[PDB]
Design a protein around this nucleic acid. Structure first.
Ligand SMILES: [Zn+2]
Length: 121
DNA sequence: ATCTCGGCAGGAAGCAGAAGAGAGG
């Protein structure tokens, strides 16, 4: 498998696998499934606002109370409410070796980037 | 008709550079 783990960059908690990640409109990344909702907590967005196809409701954070690292935002997209994750918020871990890589640009991070399909909901 | 602008710093996004829709500062 080319499947990789994303860990919290601050505490190294498991956030999700690249197999769960989907791309919206070429440059915003979300995570599928109910597992990911156990990994983050929301706070209301201090400056909630529309941009492009998104209405920002919340910021999301590592669910660990001693960590609380910023992970991205929670948005309304179409009829859905979805997380949008920052690449800077995570380290990418090779599952076989446990070696960790830091990215600040999604374009530097080479993995199978599957477009978001509403039918997967 | 270009070029310009060090770890947070003029009104999408980490050694040299996406979103109320550039100006000579
Ligand atoms: Zn964390």
């Amino acid at each position: 498998k080319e499947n990789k783990k994303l860990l919290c960059r601050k505490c190294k908690a498991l956030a999700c696998y690249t197999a769960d990640v989907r791309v919206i409109e070429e440059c915003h990344y979300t995570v599928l499934g109910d597992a990911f909702k156990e990994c983050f907590v929301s706070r209301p967005h201090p400056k909630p606002k529309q941009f492009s196809s998104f209405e920002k409701r919340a910021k999301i954070f590592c669910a660990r109370q001693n960590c609380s690292h910023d992970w991205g935002i929670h948005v309304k997209y179409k009829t859905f409410e979805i997380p949008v994750i920052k690449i800077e918020s995570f380290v990418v871990e090779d599952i076989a070796t446990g070696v960790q890589t830091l990215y600040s640009k999604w374009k530097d991070f080479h993995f199978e980037k599957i477009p978001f399909d509403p039918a997967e909901m």
